[PDB]
A paper describes a structure:
Transfer RNA–guanine transglycosylase (Tgt, EC 2.4.2.29) catalyses the exchange of a specific guanine base in tRNA molecules by a substituted 7-deazaguanine. The reaction follows a ping-pong mechanism including a covalent Tgt⋅tRNA intermediate. Hence, in an attempt to generate a model system for the active site of human Tgt and to gain insights into the relevance of particular amino acids for substrate base selectivity, we adapted the Z. mobilis Tgt active site by site-directed mutagenesis in order to mimic that of the human enzyme.
In both maps fragmentary density is visible for the dihydroxy-cyclopentenyl substituent (7H as well as 8F, 8H). Figures 7F and 7H show that the mutation of Val233 to glycine results in a considerable gain of space in the substrate binding pocket which allows the dihydroxy-cyclopentenyl of queuine to occupy the cavity located between Gly233 and the side chain of Cys/Val158. Within this cavity the dihydroxy-cyclopentenyl apparently has no specific interaction with the protein. As a consequence, it seems to be highly flexible which is reflected by the ill-defined electron density assigned to this moiety in both structures. As in the structure of queuine-bound Tgt(Cys158Val), nearly no electron density can be attributed to the side chain of Val158 in the Tgt(Cys158Val/Val233Gly)·queuine complex structure, indicating an increased mobility of this residue upon the binding of queuine. The crystal structures of Tgt(Val233Gly) and Tgt(Cys158Val/Val233Gly) with queuine reveal that the Val233Gly exchange allows the dihydroxy-cyclopentenyl substituent to occupy the created cavity between position 233 and 158. The adopted binding mode of queuine will not interfere sterically with the sugar-phosphate backbone of bound tRNA. Solely in the case of Tgt(Cys158Val/Val233Gly), the variant that should best approach the eucaryotic enzyme, the result of the trapping experiment indicates that the covalent enzyme·tRNA complex may, though to a low extent, be able to bind queuine.
Author numbering:
A (entry chain A), B (entry chain A): 11 to 383
Write the structure that this text describes.
Amino acid sequence: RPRFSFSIAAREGKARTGTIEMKRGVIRTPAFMPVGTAATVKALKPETVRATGADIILGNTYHLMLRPGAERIAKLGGLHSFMGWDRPILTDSGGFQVMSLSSLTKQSEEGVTFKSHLDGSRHMLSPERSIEIQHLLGSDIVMAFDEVTPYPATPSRAASSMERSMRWAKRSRDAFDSRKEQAENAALFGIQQGSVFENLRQQSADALAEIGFDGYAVGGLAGGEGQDEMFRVLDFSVPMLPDDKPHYLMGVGKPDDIVGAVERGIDMFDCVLPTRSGRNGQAFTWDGPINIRNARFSEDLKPLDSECHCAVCQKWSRAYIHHLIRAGEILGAMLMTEHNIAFYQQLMQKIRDSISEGRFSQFAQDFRARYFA
Amino acid sequence: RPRFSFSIAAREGKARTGTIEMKRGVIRTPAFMPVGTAATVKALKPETVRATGADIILGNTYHLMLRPGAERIAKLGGLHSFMGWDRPILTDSGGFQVMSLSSLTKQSEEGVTFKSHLDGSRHMLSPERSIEIQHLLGSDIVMAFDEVTPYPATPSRAASSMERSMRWAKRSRDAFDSRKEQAENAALFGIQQGSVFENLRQQSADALAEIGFDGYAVGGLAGGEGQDEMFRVLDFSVPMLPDDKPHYLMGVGKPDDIVGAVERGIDMFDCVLPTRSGRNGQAFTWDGPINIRNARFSEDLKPLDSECHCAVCQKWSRAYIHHLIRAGEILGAMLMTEHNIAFYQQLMQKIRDSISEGRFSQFAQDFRARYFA
Ligand SMILES: [Zn+2]
Ligand SMILES: [Zn+2]
C-alpha cells in the first residue's frame, strides 16, 4: 500500500463513497472514527472496536501529551503498539482541548502555553510542537495545528483567527515535511476556518489549497450553531475544498448530522457521542435513540435495536442492560458502547452502499422518516 | 448429564481432584468460582469469564434480591438467560451480606428482616425465602441459609449460632425438597459452623451429615482469624465432613490460602479478590502480586506475568495497563480483571494436574518458594 491514496468509486449529488489506502490499512469512506481518549476507545478492546467495523480511530493529542506523555509513548514504541490497534490512527492537533480543558492559557502568534487540568504542570503547543507530538505518537493522519474560533464570532475576530490558522497551516506543513520519516509514511490534513462567513471560508480554502494537503477538514463547526446553520455553512464551504481529496468534518456527530453532511460532500467523521452517551445510558436505534435507564425497559426482553447485527444485540436484552447501567456496572458501559459504535458503523455502511447504488437520497429520506417517527 | 455426581479421580494426602457433573456442565475440582455481583462478573463478558477457564460462577443472592429482584429475574427467564452464562451457577444464601451490608437488622429464629443499603426498602430472609429466591434465580447449586458467626466468638455464642444454623439447615433441606423442579434439577449444599471450636465443628458436621446434602461448605472462616488459625481449624474440620462429597471453603481467597486449603481437603473456592483487587491495581504473578499503579511500571514493556497464557499478557504491556489504571479507564479494570481471573484458573489447573500426577506437595512447595521469594 502507498503512503496515501484517496479514490472515489461512486458519487451521488455531492455525496461520495470510496477508499483511502494507507500503509496500515484501507479506510472506507464515508468513514466514522471512534475516538480514543488517553489511548483507549473507552470500555472497548481494540479487537472489539475493529469487530464493529471501524477502519481507523482518532487519538486526542492534548490528552496523550499530558498522560502518559508523547515522548514516553515514543520510547515504548508508538501509540499503535502501546494500545494494541495496528490500523490507521488519525490524531487531532491538541488545540481544541487546550481551549476547552486547560487552565490559564497564554496565547500568541508562536502558539499556546497552558496548565494541565490534571496536575499544575505547564505545557506548550505550537504548530511545530503539535506536529512533533503527532510524530512521536506515530500517527498516520496528522492534523495541522489551528486556532479555534469560538461560536459565535464577529467577522473581525473570525478573520483574525482564520488568518492565523492559515499561517499555522503553512508552519504545520513545513514541520511535517522536514521530518523525513513522517513525510514518507504519514499524511497531513489542513483545517478550514472562518466561522460561518462565506468569504472567510473561501479565503481559507484558497490558502489551504495553495499550501497543499492530503486532506481537508472543515473546522469550527458543531460549536453551538445548530444543525440548520451548520448545514448552511457546509453548503458553500465544502465545494471550496479540492474535490479529489478527503473532506473531514471534525467533531460531528449525531446520526442525522452525519447523513446531512455526507449529502453535502463530507467523507470523514468523529464524535465522542456514541462512546460518551453509551456510558450515560443513551442507545442508538433506527427508530431514534432510547435511554436505557428508563423504567419502561426494566422487563423489555428485546435487544437494544431490532435490526442491529452487533454482538450485544445478539446476546443481551434491554432489561439486562437497563439493570447494568442502573447499577453502575462496568459491563453496562462495555455493552452500550459496543452497540453504539456498531450502530454508527452500520449507518456508515448503509450510507456507502446506498451511494454506490445511486439510492443515497432515498436512503436519507427513509432514514429520517423512521429515526424521527 | 445427571442432576449431580461428584467423582474423585485422584488423591494425594488430603488433596483431591475430580469432577462434579451437573445438567448445565462439568465442574473440574479443585475449582475456583469467579463472583458475579449483581448478575455480572465485574468488567467481563461471560464469554471472557469462560475463556479464562471458569467452569462455574457464583451469584450473590442478597444483591440480586435487592436489584434487579428475584421475581423479576424469574419473569425474564432466570439468571442464566438474564446475564448470558449458560454453565452452572452457585448462589450463596444471602445471609452473610445481610450482616455486612444491610441496615437495621432484626434477627429471630424465623429469619432476618433488614433495610436495603440501596433504598429504604425493607426485605426479609429466612431459610424458606432464601431457598425460594435461589429457585427463582434458577441456581444450580443452592446454599443452605445459615446464621453467620462473627470472629471472634465466645464458645456460648458460637454454639448458639451453630445450633440455629443446623435448625435452619433442616428447614433449607425441606424447602428445597418440597419444590419438585428444584429438587430434580439443582443441588443443595449445607454449611458447617462452629467458629474455631473443634467440638462445635463436630456437632455441626454430624448434624449436616444426618440431614444429608450434596456438598458441604466450611463456613465462618476468613473472618479475620488469619491464615495460621484458619489452617488449624481446617485441619480438624474438613475430615469431619463426608469424604465422598465436595468440600467448599466459602470466601477464600488469596492464592496461598487456596493452596493450603486444598492440602487440607477443600474442593471449591470463591473470592472477590481477583476481581476487586483487579480494579484496584493489584495483579497476581507467580512471583507474588504487584501493584500496577507503582511508578516503576510506567515504562515496563513486559506482560503482567511472564508465564501467564491469558489474552491480556499476550497483547498488552505493564506500562499500558499502568497508564489505564492511573487514568481511571474502564479498559484498565477489564484487563486487570481478565488477567487476575485467568491467573486463578491457571493456579487451579496446576493444582489439579499436580494432584493427578501425585506431585502436589512438591507443587505447593515450589509455588511458595517463588511466590514469596
Ligand atoms: Zn446492537
Ligand atoms: Zn495474564
